[PDB]
Write a protein that binds this ligand. Structure first.
Ligand SMILES: [Mg+2]
Ligand SMILES: [Mg+2]
Ligand SMILES: [Mg+2]
Ligand SMILES: [Mg+2]
Ligand SMILES: [Mg+2]
Ligand SMILES: [Mg+2]
Ligand SMILES: [Mg+2]
Ligand SMILES: [Mg+2]
Ligand SMILES: [Mg+2]
Ligand SMILES: [Mg+2]
Ligand SMILES: [Mg+2]
Ligand SMILES: [Mg+2]
Ligand SMILES: [Mg+2]
Ligand SMILES: [Mg+2]
Ligand SMILES: [Mg+2]
Ligand SMILES: [Mg+2]
Ligand SMILES: [Mg+2]
Ligand SMILES: [Mg+2]
Ligand SMILES: [Mg+2]
Ligand SMILES: [Mg+2]
Ligand SMILES: [Mg+2]
Ligand SMILES: [Mg+2]
Ligand SMILES: [Mg+2]
Ligand SMILES: [Mg+2]
Ligand SMILES: [Mg+2]
Ligand SMILES: [Mg+2]
Ligand SMILES: [Mg+2]
Ligand SMILES: [Mg+2]
Ligand SMILES: [Mg+2]
Ligand SMILES: [Mg+2]
Ligand SMILES: [Mg+2]
Ligand SMILES: [Mg+2]
Ligand SMILES: [Mg+2]
Ligand SMILES: [Mg+2]
Ligand SMILES: [Mg+2]
Ligand SMILES: [Mg+2]
Ligand SMILES: [Mg+2]
Ligand SMILES: [Mg+2]
Ligand SMILES: [Mg+2]
Ligand SMILES: [Mg+2]
Ligand SMILES: [Mg+2]
Ligand SMILES: [Mg+2]
Ligand SMILES: [Mg+2]
Ligand SMILES: [Mg+2]
Ligand SMILES: [Mg+2]
Ligand SMILES: [Mg+2]
Lengths: 126, 50, 119, 71, 52, 49, 87, 149
RNA sequence: AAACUUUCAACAACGGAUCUCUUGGUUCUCGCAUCGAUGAAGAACGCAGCGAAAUGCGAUACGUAAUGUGAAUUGCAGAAUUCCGUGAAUCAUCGAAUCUUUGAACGCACAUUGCGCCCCUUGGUAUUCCAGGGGGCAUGCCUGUUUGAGCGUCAU
RNA sequence: CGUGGAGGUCAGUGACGAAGCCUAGACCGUAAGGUCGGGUCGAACGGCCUCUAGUGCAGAUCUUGGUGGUAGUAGCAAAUAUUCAAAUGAGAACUUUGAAGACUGAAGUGGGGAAAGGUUCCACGUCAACAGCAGUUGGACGUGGGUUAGUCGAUCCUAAGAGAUGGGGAAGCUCCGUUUCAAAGGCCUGAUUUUAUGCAGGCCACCAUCGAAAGGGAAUCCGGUUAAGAUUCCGGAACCUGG
RNA sequence: AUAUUGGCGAGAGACCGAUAGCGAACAAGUACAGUGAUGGAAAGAUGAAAAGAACUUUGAAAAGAGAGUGAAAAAGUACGUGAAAUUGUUGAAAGGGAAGGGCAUUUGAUCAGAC
């Protein structure tokens, strides 16, 4: 149960906030868990997903496949990993839209800001 | 009326630039609900009223 | 692409005017090319560069005028602060705290004390 | 507009709605370094302003049109 | 809402040979003009004994 | 281009079935006419010939 | 001949465009707008017409200045600028 | 674009399309089209349609008269090109695209995409890679989006 | 006997009920006090690389500056100083600016994109003629300043 | 007996198929109704004990939406009138050109304009809807091009009239009035040399402003030119005002 | 201490569920009407994902038939489910100036229980 008077348990308000969230809020809404290896390595459970991470699909028809993120489509609430596509007989290939909560990050894209963010969340870097 | 004022000619120029169908690249957008121009005007169909 | 305001702030007046007329010539020839081609994605960057240069020139002149009117009574009305019309018309703290000598002596003699009942 | 160049030394420009014939003549002399004989103007049915600028015979509009860069 | 089913301008056309005597929306050119109004049996009208 | 063309052709269908002569034809018919469904006729002056 | 033959003699105008409200309600012989009341200083509105007040009230336009007053109040009518780096 | 390592230039050779015909409005365009039809079925430069060409001396008055002729001929060619009576022959640059980039990036409509904005149709109705499903527009978008090109 | 009419059943039409849904409405409670001559509310006309609206904005025109976040936007095009960055973006924040023609609307007028006057400057040989740029010129009232009026009135 | 919600219970039913809908199948009740099978469908819903109501329709010349018979019926009959060949095209009573026959008959079915409309003008592409038959055609649909002035108008003047100011009414929104019972404003000579323009030394009777694209009014003609513009563009030849 | 159908920010309900609830769940004070003051609508739902039907063949074409995508086109931008009025085809029956109903049985068709 909630205790604060500023939190709302209203389904209409929650659904309106989700469907009219802006881009910088959609960044945090599209978060993905780490692997057990990276979790034991870094001390972090989940991170927001980025355009050059190597993931693994753990749910759905494409469960078991790997690849790099090629696009993070924040408008369509989805992510597009390379080499996970549906092909046609005339030679076309459309990408599959995946949700990031049904993926596992296996390798990060580490720069200055992500190192600061992991140290902010209270992980280790050595 | 072939001898008009600048105010009338200005409103006529805006109404001329507004008279177009829908651009086709707008139909291809993500979650597009505009299917036609619902405010199209024609000279013999409906009048401008100055 | 485009100009950067932190790099424009290290320049002077005639240098900013020269950069302004260069960008204006470039926008002119880009409109000439747009007459033949519909999609030209450099027009947006040249327009934002012109707006940035104009912003920096205006803020330099306004800073000069503020230093010229520093400290004086009767500054110009746009350099004056704008809260609201009612806030500008209200009394100041000095006029609000003006007090008669009779009341001032009364507040000196008998101010409200601190006390407790408990013991 | 192309026909008028090889006809009467006439360049055709789109100008601001706030400009008059003195300002048009002065701006053409400033921008292209020529001498102007005449300026005729109209307001178009789409709401813009168009000027026909006739140059003097010691100048050629074909040269300016090549410089500007649309011919 | 205390004004629901009352924000319209309508008048009864009278006793005649064709239509019933409900108040009807006047005007022209919209599809709503000529339609019945204000009754609890009319579409868009007020309800019987509105809740307080 | 042919995708958007087929889109527009499938979208104009119901307007075509209502026989509008374009997207600018928006004539609205009223429900009932007062001059056709009001009044009575006496022995004096009448409303139509 | 009070109907359709006399509807053919209908080619002048009683009202033209207004300058304050822009509506075509400006009577040319009265020199008065029958909608906004121009050129009177006060804008014409009545309490027996509430739908017209609802049509022309505040918030039906752009609100070019009033839409920022609540933010300026909440921030406290501050002046100056912001500092960098949180340092 | 904003690319710094690019070339920007106009072609200098033109090609007459003899299966097209359209009466022009400019008198210089009509005279120049008479010269072009006299020239033949080979690519031509605008300098070759001059009357001062070829040079019988090295004196620069023939250069000045040829440049004035070119100034008139550009105005003629502007209307001859507008009505598809004549087309330009293009300038090319050899360019390298990585195969792993080609096979990693994907097309939504493989076989059915073409240009529809080009003017020559033999480029535009061409498949570079037929049994992979990549067209000319998609191949040039891959070449533009690669940084290792 | 068929056809035709009517009844009964299966399938197919016409039409949009019922069911399931819901980024909307409606009512109640809590907290707060902030429009305008420093030009408001409202109006007109414009502005996007490719838009008619809705939503934004004013010739710096779907925006400029500053501050935060930290890699997108997406229909296409295009983003190295877009990229281990003094940095995407219809992102959030917003304290600096810009703010056409109007409107209480303020030089006069306005069914007109009409007509003036003053100051500084630049160009035409020019205090007198013409043109461009910049800055001004409403009414009522209050306090003060200056110039005045009246045998209203005092001393010379 | 039945319906929408609420509290409790059946650790109730349900993707091995909830609710709804159809059913020349089955059973129970005097009845309101309840229950089972089959088909269709794809995500929620019941029994009992209680609480509550915007709780049950054949009608109101009821409201809104939909659909019939009449019925392939009435009708598509004012304005004297059409025919032949070729071309185009999937297709021609109706489009284009040619060959014929007619009509308007200069108070024309001709050539221009004023109110009003607003791009309908013209070119290219082109037929789903519209043109009460048709359509390859169009004032339709899609994309563009086109309106050039010292002399033509407006702008200026006043007409019938409208209307501020100074004043005077009215609780007030506002009313009267237009030179009024007001200290109502300009030309210049000055003198000319802080020298630039303070007084000038004579004036000053009129009182704002709006009101005519047919009244009053400074000045332009001819020839050529476009797909579409011209007393405006080009060529030639004039005139008027101001300096 | 009291008022508050406006403005700004929040939290809720034995409230309504697209002919209801505000006129407006959607580019709604919009489209459209009127000289004017004013009057004033209709209109939500493919699918998890457009993967929105490539290719062959008949046709001038719209389209059809194959094929294909999909869990399903008994989901094809006329798109969840698809009632009634009204209509088409097939099967069964009746019919010498209406049709329908009650009691009773014959004929044909069809059907459950059960020993
Ligand atoms: Mg209207
Ligand atoms: Mg003119
Ligand atoms: Mg209601
Ligand atoms: Mg008359
Ligand atoms: Mg009148
Ligand atoms: Mg807008
Ligand atoms: Mg302003
Ligand atoms: Mg006038
Ligand atoms: Mg005083
Ligand atoms: Mg209820
Ligand atoms: Mg219930
Ligand atoms: Mg279960
Ligand atoms: Mg079921
Ligand atoms: Mg039955
Ligand atoms: Mg029951
Ligand atoms: Mg229960
Ligand atoms: Mg009831
Ligand atoms: Mg009922
Ligand atoms: Mg009924
Ligand atoms: Mg009854
Ligand atoms: Mg009905
Ligand atoms: Mg018949
Ligand atoms: Mg008849
Ligand atoms: Mg006849
Ligand atoms: Mg005929
Ligand atoms: Mg005769
Ligand atoms: Mg005759
Ligand atoms: Mg005569
Ligand atoms: Mg035509
Ligand atoms: Mg044509
Ligand atoms: Mg027809
Ligand atoms: Mg037809
Ligand atoms: Mg057209
Ligand atoms: Mg008066
Ligand atoms: Mg006048
Ligand atoms: Mg006149
Ligand atoms: Mg006379
Ligand atoms: Mg003509
Ligand atoms: Mg001439
Ligand atoms: Mg409703
Ligand atoms: Mg309604
Ligand atoms: Mg009418
Ligand atoms: Mg539906
Ligand atoms: Mg289905
Ligand atoms: Mg249907
Ligand atoms: Mg039925």
């Amino acid at each position: 149960a909630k205790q604060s008077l500023d939190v709302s348990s209203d389904r209409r308000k929650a659904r309106k906030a989700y469907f009219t969230a802006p881009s910088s809020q959609r960044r945090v809404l599209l978060s993905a868990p780490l692997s057990k290896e990276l979790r034991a390595q870094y001390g972090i459970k989940a991170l927001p997903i980025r355009r050059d991470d190597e993931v693994l699909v753990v749910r759905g028809s494409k469960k078991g496949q790997e690849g790099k993120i090629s696009s993070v489509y924040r408008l369509k609430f989805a992510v597009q990993v390379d080499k996970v596509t549906k092909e046609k007989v005339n030679g076309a290939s459309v990408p599959i839209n995946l949700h990031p909560s049904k993926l596992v990050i296996t390798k990060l894209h580490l720069d200055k800001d992500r190192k600061a963010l992991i140290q902010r969340k209270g992980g280790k870097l050595e | 009326a072939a001898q008009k004022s600048f105010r009338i000619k200005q409103k006529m120029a805006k109404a001329k630039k507004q008279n177009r169908p829908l651009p086709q690249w707008i139909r291809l957008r993500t979650n597009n609900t505009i299917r036609y121009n619902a405010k199209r005007r024609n000279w013999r169909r409906t009048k401008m009223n100055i | 692409a485009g100009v950067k305001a932190y790099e424009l702030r290290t320049k002077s007046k005639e240098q900013l005017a020269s950069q302004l007329v260069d960008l204006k010539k470039e926008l002119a020839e880009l409109k000439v090319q747009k007459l033949s081609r519909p999609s030209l994605p450099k027009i947006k960057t040249v327009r934002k560069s012109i707006a940035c240069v104009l912003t920096v020139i205006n803020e330099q002149q306004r800073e000069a005028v503020r230093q010229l009117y520093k400290g004086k009574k009767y500054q110009p009305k746009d350099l004056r602060a704008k809260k609201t019309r009612a806030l500008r018309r209200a009394l100041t703290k000095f006029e609000a705290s003006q007090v008669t000598e009779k009341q001032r002596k009364k507040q000196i003699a008998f101010p409200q004390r601190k006390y407790a009942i408990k013991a | 507009a192309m026909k008028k160049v090889e006809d009467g030394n006439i360049l055709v420009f789109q100008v601001s709605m706030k400009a008059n014939k003195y300002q048009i003549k002065k701006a053409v002399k400033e921008l292209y370094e020529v001498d102007v004989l005449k300026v005729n103007t109209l307001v178009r049915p789409n709401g813009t302003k168009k000027a026909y600028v006739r140059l003097t015979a010691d100048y050629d509009a074909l040269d300016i049109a090549n410089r500007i860069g649309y011919i | 809402s205390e004004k629901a089913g009352h924000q319209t301008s309508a008048e009864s056309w009278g006793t005649g040979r064709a239509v019933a005597r409900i108040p009807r929306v006047g005007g022209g050119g919209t599809g709503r003009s000529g339609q019945g109004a204000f009754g609890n049996m009319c579409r868009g009208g007020r309800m019987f004994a509105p809740t307080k | 281009r042919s995708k958007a063309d087929r889109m527009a052709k499938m979208e104009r269908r119901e307007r075509n079935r209502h026989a509008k002569q374009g997207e600018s034809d928006r004539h609205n018919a009223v429900s009932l006419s007062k001059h056709l469904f009001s009044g009575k006729r006496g022995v004096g002056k009448t409303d139509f010939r | 001949g009070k109907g359709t033959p006399s509807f053919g003699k209908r080619h002048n105008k009683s009202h033209t465009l207004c300058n304050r409200c822009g509506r075509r309600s400006f009577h040319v012989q009265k020199k008065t707008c029958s909608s906004c009341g121009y050129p009177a200083a006060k804008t014409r509105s009545y309490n027996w017409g509430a739908k017209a007040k609802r049509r022309h009230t505040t918030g039906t336009g752009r609100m070019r200045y009033l839409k920022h007053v609540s933010r300026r109040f909440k921030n406290g009518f501050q002046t100056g600028s912001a500092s960098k780096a949180s340092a | 674009s904003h690319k710094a390592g690019e070339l920007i230039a106009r072609p200098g050779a033109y090609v007459r399309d003899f299966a097209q015909t359209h009466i022009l409005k400019l008198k210089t365009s009509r005279q120049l089209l008479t010269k072009i039809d006299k020239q033949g079925v080979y690519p031509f430069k605008l300098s070759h349609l001059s009357s001062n060409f070829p040079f019988v001396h090295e004196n620069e008055e023939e250069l000045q008269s040829l440049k004035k002729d070119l100034k008139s001929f550009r105005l003629g060619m502007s209307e001859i090109s507008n009505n598809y009576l004549c087309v330009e022959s293009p300038i090319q640059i050899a360019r390298w695209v990585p195969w792993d980039h080609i096979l990693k990036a994907t097309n939504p409509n493989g076989n059915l995409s073409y240009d529809a904005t080009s003017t020559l149709t033999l480029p535009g109705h061409e498949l570079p890679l037929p049994k992979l499903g990549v067209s000319a527009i998609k191949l040039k978008s891959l070449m533009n989006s690669t940084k290792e090109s």
